[PDB]
Amino acid sequence: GDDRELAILATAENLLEDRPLADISVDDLAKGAGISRPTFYFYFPSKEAVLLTLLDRVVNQADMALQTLAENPADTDRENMWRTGINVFFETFGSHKAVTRAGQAARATSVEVAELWSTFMQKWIAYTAAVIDAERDRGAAPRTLPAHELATALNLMNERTLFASFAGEQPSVPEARVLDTLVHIWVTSIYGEN
Amino acid sequence: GDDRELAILATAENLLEDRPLADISVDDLAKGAGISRPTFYFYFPSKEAVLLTLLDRVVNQADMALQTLAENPADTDRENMWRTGINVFFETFGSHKAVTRAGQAARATSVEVAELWSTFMQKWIAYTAAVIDAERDRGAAPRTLPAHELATALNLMNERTLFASFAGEQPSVPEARVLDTLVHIWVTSIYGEN
């Protein structure tokens, strides 16, 4: 009986838009799904383990998303081949701000999360560097910096930047700009010369 | 004061080298520093307090340093002018990696610390904007992205990255490159066209 789990997962993410994981208790979730306080414990050991699943879900959506682009190509220049990738992350995480803010300010307390993140950040960081080269052996991008390093600076910038945008921090870049703001910085560097 | 307010500090900083604040005692600080428990408290109320100062001392160091380039302009090529500026941080914080690591795992629970970094980061992001602006008035820089917003992204990148390097995370850019890297991206996007 799958259903039940989604109920719990979904319920959390839609309570997280109002308060953190602390202000929420294993019961407030029992209702949302439609099970007795105890039933819960058969799908999740604790609320902690729920956020982790949320997070992982959200993170995989991104990989599965960007993955789809590693398949069918898009008939459009080089500025979009990049933009459209970053937008996955903007668009995606930008949709589950709550879970992002939640996963983040919880990285400092869950190796599971820290890893889950510290992992993909490497697949994504790799995928990128890959293209950086696949755009150098075709002679389109100058051989300036070592792809991986270059790719890392960019990639990490995203994380911090796209975050302070969703967390409403200050310093930050108004959400409706953070994109163009990023894409430009990617391209100008991925390709720029001197 | 100072003599004894300095002992503590230094005596703290050198202790953060081997372990985290959470493992350092008021005792371990009174000793190594050379003073008495009570004498400490006359200067500091808690250890987090000593941390907040060490941090305030580092941060401010870098600001004056940077501040000290406005009066000593000199002759040079567009690029280098940035490396020496971005260098001020990688050099400063990268010579106090322990504090940095500490003041970091503190922004999550210290509003004094939160406001501290945030209050500066703005002054640094601003300073960037000021330049990237007048850099356009003189004709060198192309008028693309809204300075402050470009300045921000870049600054947001140097935060999350230099740290990710000092704290030797996974993934990160080896402490031994980052300067060459960050410097690149800043320029190529500041003066870059599209």
From Swiss-Prot, chains A, B:
PROSITE patterns: HTH_TETR_2
Pfam families to which the protein is assigned, alphabetical: EthR_C, TetR_N
Ranges for domain HTH tetR-type: 2-62
Keyword Repressor attributed: yes
Cleaved signal peptide residues: none
SUPFAM superfamilies membership: Homeodomain-like, Tetracyclin repressor-like, C-terminal domain
Record keywords, A-Z: DNA-binding, Repressor, Transcription, Transcription regulation
Function in brief: Involved in the repression of the monooxygenase EthA which is responsible of the formation of the active metabolite of ethionamide (ETH).
Subunit relationships: Homodimer.
Protein's name in the database: HTH-type transcriptional regulator EthR
Lineage of the organism: Bacteria, Bacillati, Actinomycetota, Actinomycetes, Mycobacteriales
Gene: ethR
